[PDB]
Amino acid sequence: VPTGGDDPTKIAMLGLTFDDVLLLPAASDVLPANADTSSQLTKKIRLKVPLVSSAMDTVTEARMAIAMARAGGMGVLHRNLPVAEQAAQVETVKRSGGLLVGAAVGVGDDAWERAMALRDAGVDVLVVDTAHAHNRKVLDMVHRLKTTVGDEIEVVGGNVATRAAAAALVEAGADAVKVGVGPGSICTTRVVAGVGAPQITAILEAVAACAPHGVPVIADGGLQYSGDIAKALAAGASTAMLGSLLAGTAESPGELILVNGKQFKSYRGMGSLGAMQVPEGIEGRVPFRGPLSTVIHQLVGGLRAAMGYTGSATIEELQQAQFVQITAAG
Amino acid sequence: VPTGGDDPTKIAMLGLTFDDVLLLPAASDVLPANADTSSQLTKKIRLKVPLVSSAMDTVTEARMAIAMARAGGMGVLHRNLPVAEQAAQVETVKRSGGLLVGAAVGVGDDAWERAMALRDAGVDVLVVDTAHAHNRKVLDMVHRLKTTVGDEIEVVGGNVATRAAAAALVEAGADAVKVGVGPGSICTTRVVAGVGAPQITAILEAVAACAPHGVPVIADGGLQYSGDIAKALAAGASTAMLGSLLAGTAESPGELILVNGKQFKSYRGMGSLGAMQVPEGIEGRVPFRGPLSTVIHQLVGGLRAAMGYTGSATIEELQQAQFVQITAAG
Amino acid sequence: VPTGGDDPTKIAMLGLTFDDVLLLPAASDVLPANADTSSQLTKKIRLKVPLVSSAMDTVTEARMAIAMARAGGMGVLHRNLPVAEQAAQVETVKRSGGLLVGAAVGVGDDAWERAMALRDAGVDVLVVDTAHAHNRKVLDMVHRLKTTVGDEIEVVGGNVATRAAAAALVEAGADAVKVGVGPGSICTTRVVAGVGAPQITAILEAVAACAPHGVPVIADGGLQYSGDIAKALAAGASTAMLGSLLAGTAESPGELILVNGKQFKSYRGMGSLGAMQVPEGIEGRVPFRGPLSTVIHQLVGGLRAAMGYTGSATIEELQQAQFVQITAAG
Amino acid sequence: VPTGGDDPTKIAMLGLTFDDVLLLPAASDVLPANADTSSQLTKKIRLKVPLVSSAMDTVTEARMAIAMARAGGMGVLHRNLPVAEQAAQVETVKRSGGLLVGAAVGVGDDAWERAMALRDAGVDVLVVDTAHAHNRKVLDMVHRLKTTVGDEIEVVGGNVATRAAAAALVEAGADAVKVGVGPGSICTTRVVAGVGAPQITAILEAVAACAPHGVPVIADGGLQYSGDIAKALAAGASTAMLGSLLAGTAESPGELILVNGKQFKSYRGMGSLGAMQVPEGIEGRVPFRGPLSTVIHQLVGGLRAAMGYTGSATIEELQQAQFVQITAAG
Numbered sequence A, B, C, D: 001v002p003t004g005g006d007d008p009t010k011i012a013m014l015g016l017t018f019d020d021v022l023l024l025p026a027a028s029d030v031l032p033a034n035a036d037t038s039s040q041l042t043k044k045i046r047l048k049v050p051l052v053s054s055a056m057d058t059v060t061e062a063r064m065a066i067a068m069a070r071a072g073g074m075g076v077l078h079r080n081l082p083v084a085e086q087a088a089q090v091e092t093v094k095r096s097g098g099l100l101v102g103a104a105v106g107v108g109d110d111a112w113e114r115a116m117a118l119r120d121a122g123v124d125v126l127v128v129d130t131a132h133a134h135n136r137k138v139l140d141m142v143h144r145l146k147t148t149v150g151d152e153i154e155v156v157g158g159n160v161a162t163r164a165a166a167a168a169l170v171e172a173g174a175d176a177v178k179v180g181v182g183p184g185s186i187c188t189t190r191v192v193a194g195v196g197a198p199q200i201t202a203i204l205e206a207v208a209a210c211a212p213h214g215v216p217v218i219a220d221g222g223l224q225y226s227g228d229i230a231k232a233l234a235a236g237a238s239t240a241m242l243g244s245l246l247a248g249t250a251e252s253p254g255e256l257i258l259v260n261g262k263q264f265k266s267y268r269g270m271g272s273l274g275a276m277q278v279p280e281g282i283e284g285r286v287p288f289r290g291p292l293s294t295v296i297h298q299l300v301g302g303l304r305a306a307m308g309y310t311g312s313a314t315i316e317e318l319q320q321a322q323f324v325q326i327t328a329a330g
């Protein structure tokens, strides 16, 4: 073994991230304005725009969830607050019309009671929200929700970064699988635990387990540019979840911060000291970006451009596009 | 598949850019001063110097086109202006003697009328100027021009970054194929759409489709140093198109800008907000470089040095040179 | 041979360091709080926490050794001081209860007398401390100690970076093998001598020689984050030795230094000019980190997180985890 | 072909530089102080220290040549001065005892007359000094010198970066071959001409042509640290030529320059505008380093350390050492 030892499987794969690849152009009869950007969030739920906002307390509360749904995507309400307040935020979103909304739950002692309160409030999607879903407690939670409320509510499980973990969630009854261990902009899992998987390889592996069973993959974490959304979907994901890219918008929680003459908003990991009060997230800031509607317009515009370049009339066609791998000289 | 999934073709190639390679020296009887730098711009048109200026409104109007032709190359007049004005710039170049000139046209509603006005003004080369030529509308335009005015005017099509796209332009009747999707210094296609192809690999692939049919390849975008011109031609291109390297010259459009005691000129993508008024270009500045004649002298001097090192008496011999691939430690 | 010459063995391997890999998550029934972090320091000695402090005069004297043992690890007392003083530091550690302690010896003229004084003071572990243990003088020292005092004292040999060197120490009777040639944060062996081995590959190779004989490997040098400890153990090491990560703690030797409003402590290589008075170490500073107990808590917390993600109930299970190799885009 | 086109030989090799590799330690009975650092400069001339100073007007005139010879190496006098003055510098070196000295000549009109004046002055080594020796004019010069004065004077030819070029110089009668196209610290050949070869691969290839014929290789350019000297020799070179590493010494030409409170000396390429008055070198400065004797002591000290780590008793044994290739994470 050229990298050491006598076991070829010790280093099991070469992991690629978004910056390691570009989409290859292909023959196209598709104009960006004419592409169809709709895609499955879950087995049953299709979004007009393949984007969902992160379940984070500096990204998604009712205002963001309402704005995301109006824009054609969806928000996932964070769970760092009392059950009653989270359920009230679901109701608030529903007071603004026939808008889709999701909400995060954990696997702890109060997670089931949280899920039932969200159900009663009319939530459309429950996201079982963990850093590592390949665990009997997480799989049991997904299965029990699906068996209990799965006729009326779609159940998402995550996060995973391997084929086997994705397969386990599929077996448990997940209506979608969320992919990303380590890639988030505010994440320190890779430095604290030394654990992770580069996101393009993680998506390719998860899709190999999920697509044969008709289960969509949500690419969660590490997206920095609109072009990364196109790369995530071309790797086989059906939607992308965004934290950093949406945290600086008017509709996110938090106030404006002025630093050296420039405007910022606070953005922090849910595993940061601040959010919890051994952290696996940090607390920082991102530039202020203005209204959500305008950010989504630019992100979808980039996606539409990719669809034009690759000849993809639909997201399902984009999922079949090819990559070229690039070097550091990039 | 070591990088993920079960499909070896998902990542279709490893893309190299200029900074990934160096030309290997070889046995030489060639002195730099004695090398022949002439090369085909198109099937019928040979230039004394294998360089053409970009069709950009901060690079090529009549002054630059005149200077480029006098230097042994050619300019391609930009099309971000009324048809009458572009045709008048062609006439202005012709008032300065028997000088070659090209001009860009699009594929939109007024593109045909633009092409005919340029024809009437005495243009030598029409460049069908798109970000992605592998499209029936672009191919049809190339073919219709070739069939209509192709006895008197050479028709260039672009841009492409793949073998199949190059082959399609050849089939459509292109007299030259222009290569470059994503590599321009002011380009944001790779970050906005996530689409592109590293330029050495793009040229190698395009040449594999074009050279067997006797169609020259124009390497367009990403050239930063004179040595990059030699690399582009050794990869098989017949000429190089330059934007950034020529934008800071006296002959480019625009005035001098003084910033922190240094001199600059404005340089912007034609897909930038400023040029258009979802942008795929930015607006910036490059250092002021003085007269065009002096810049071309240094660029051709570097090319001549490469020809001496590689034993290439002609550009056709340089196209057969070999590379060594280098690492980040470079 | 693609990299030059006609001998494929001239470049014998591709060396990976900590930053080249990540641990892959795997199926887990392990909660971080419930993982067992104990591991063999030597054949006979098991630590509660798999961490030992470097034998350096800016890291380990009696205060650090006492604190490390109380925290569940061990200190190795440095040998840059008179024999009588080093032996007195061993006695000081013993005055604080039933605490494990190690101490470094060289192979020079006074090394044997040093070892016997340490023996008489009640040392538990003797570390034969060299930059390159694959040498008859070092191997003889290890063997002679083992034959003379090996019933009452565990004998560690190092350092090595190759399989053959590790095998030689095992043959000589080493109770543990310490791995690391070149990777230390204050080390200049790689720039001065041009010699070294990236630490993940060095550990994989040393473990291939040591594990079949039941001899634990101590990963020494280059660890910068808690996640690196998990990577070192997953590569097959049984403990990690830390210098930089512990040098800024209250318990290390040296006073606080104030620079530009921030607090630091001095940290220097034992091969630096300062320590010796052709240096192979430098003298610098690291941020002040507060009490040792708190640093160890965060480091072990990260290790525990890795054990949870990889489904490792014990360190022996963690040694079987798998990696993904990452690119520069990381 | 994964990198483009249909020709696997277009990219002929993967080129490694010094920073791409480390020397592997091996079993050693060698103490640094006891290693033998002597090595062949040419077929007939053996140096005590395997180092020669560059033929540059900011590195080697008589003072440096005298100091280098006294230190056990040799200087090569630059040729950017009248023939009479260069010959007088040779005589000056000879007035200081039985000291070896070399001198550069070109291949131009006055090169033969220069060589004969140097011969008459008692030069020991003539270096045919070109950027690309694979050329009939350079090969003819080497052969004619060897046939004319080769009984009394050793004739070095260079520079080369390929096996075939090295073989040609050997055939022409070279007593040593100097390797390096593009790697010099002040060199811009790689950016101006786009031509070069990473130096470890260049040495491995040149040695494959030279060693079978008993012709030593001089590694010239790109050495930044003492460890690079050990790497160059382990790749198979017999000596190293140094420019940058010696330009800041007291014995180099030029005065002290004070910039922002620090001391520097001027260092410039012989192909820079300043030296010539299309440049392939730049003009800059390097830190002042003090006496040559002290710099050589540190460089040889690093070499001696490498010999100890690799178990190399002699330079011929070091030439058989092995490498590990490292990544960017290095």
Ligand SMILES: O=c1[nH]cnc2c1ncn2[C@@H]1O[C@H](COP(=O)(O)O)[C@@H](O)[C@H]1O
Pocket: A054, A055, A056, A159, A180, A183, A184, A185, A186, A187, A188, A189, A220, A221, A222, A223, A241, A242, A243, A244, A245, A268, A269, A270, A271, A272, A280, A281, A282
């Ligand atoms: O504290 C944390 N540590 C690690 N990952 C986090 C943390 N908080 C949120 N995440 C994940 O990071 C994603 C956002 O990543 P981003 O879009 O790159 O900023 C979220 O959707 C989570 O999956």
Ligand SMILES: O=c1[nH]cnc2c1ncn2[C@@H]1O[C@H](COP(=O)(O)O)[C@@H](O)[C@H]1O
Pocket: B054, B055, B056, B159, B180, B183, B184, B185, B186, B187, B188, B189, B220, B221, B222, B223, B241, B242, B243, B244, B245, B268, B269, B270, B271, B272, B280, B281, B282
């Ligand atoms: O706005 C833009 N976005 C992307 N590419 C552009 C844009 N404008 C011009 N280009 C291309 O960039 C080339 C110049 O690249 P440069 O020489 O690297 O600056 C031009 O010849 C075009 O092919």
Ligand SMILES: O=c1[nH]cnc2c1ncn2[C@@H]1O[C@H](COP(=O)(O)O)[C@@H](O)[C@H]1O
Pocket: C054, C055, C056, C159, C180, C183, C184, C185, C186, C187, C188, C189, C220, C221, C222, C223, C241, C242, C243, C244, C245, C268, C269, C270, C271, C272, C280, C281, C282
């Ligand atoms: O001067 C030196 N040069 C090279 N390595 C050293 C020196 N001093 C200590 N070391 C080694 O560096 C280790 C600490 O590495 P660190 O934890 O990366 O700072 C120590 O345990 C030694 O193995």
Ligand SMILES: O=c1[nH]cnc2c1ncn2[C@@H]1O[C@H](COP(=O)(O)O)[C@@H](O)[C@H]1O
Pocket: D054, D055, D056, D159, D180, D183, D184, D185, D186, D187, D188, D189, D220, D221, D222, D223, D241, D242, D243, D244, D245, D268, D269, D270, D271, D272, D280, D281, D282
């Ligand atoms: O102007 C120049 N351009 C390119 N190489 C040069 C020039 N002048 C000297 N050299 C070479 O650079 C070597 C010194 O490289 P250095 O030790 O890396 O600074 C010299 O021995 C020459 O072989």
Ligand SMILES: Cc1n[nH]c(C)c1S(=O)(=O)Nc1ccc2c[nH]nc2c1
Pocket: A129, A130, A131, A132, A159, A180, A181, A182, A183, A187, A189, A269, A270, A271, A272, A280, A281
């Ligand atoms: C550290 C942790 N354990 N369980 C949760 C929930 C968290 S978190 O608050 O920090 N959020 C996430 C979410 C997704 C992640 C992917 N990698 N790391 C992640 C962390």
Ligand SMILES: Cc1n[nH]c(C)c1S(=O)(=O)Nc1ccc2c[nH]nc2c1
Pocket: B129, B130, B131, B132, B159, B180, B181, B182, B183, B187, B189, B269, B270, B271, B272, B280, B281
């Ligand atoms: C975004 C776009 N679509 N069509 C055009 C024309 C443009 S442009 O104005 O921005 N010019 C170019 C030209 C070449 C390119 C290669 N990659 N991207 C490019 C952009």
Ligand SMILES: Cc1n[nH]c(C)c1S(=O)(=O)Nc1ccc2c[nH]nc2c1
Pocket: C129, C130, C131, C132, C159, C180, C181, C182, C183, C187, C189, C269, C270, C271, C272, C280, C281
């Ligand atoms: C240069 C030297 N020779 N012998 C010793 C002891 C030293 S040291 O003081 O500098 N310590 C170490 C320890 C471990 C090392 C791994 N690589 N280099 C190292 C240096």
Ligand SMILES: Cc1n[nH]c(C)c1S(=O)(=O)Nc1ccc2c[nH]nc2c1
Pocket: D129, D130, D131, D132, D159, D180, D181, D182, D183, D187, D189, D269, D270, D271, D272, D280, D281
């Ligand atoms: C550009 C040139 N042609 N001939 C000479 C002599 C020169 S130089 O003055 O610039 N010196 C060197 C010497 C070695 C080199 C390796 N690569 N480039 C080099 C340049």
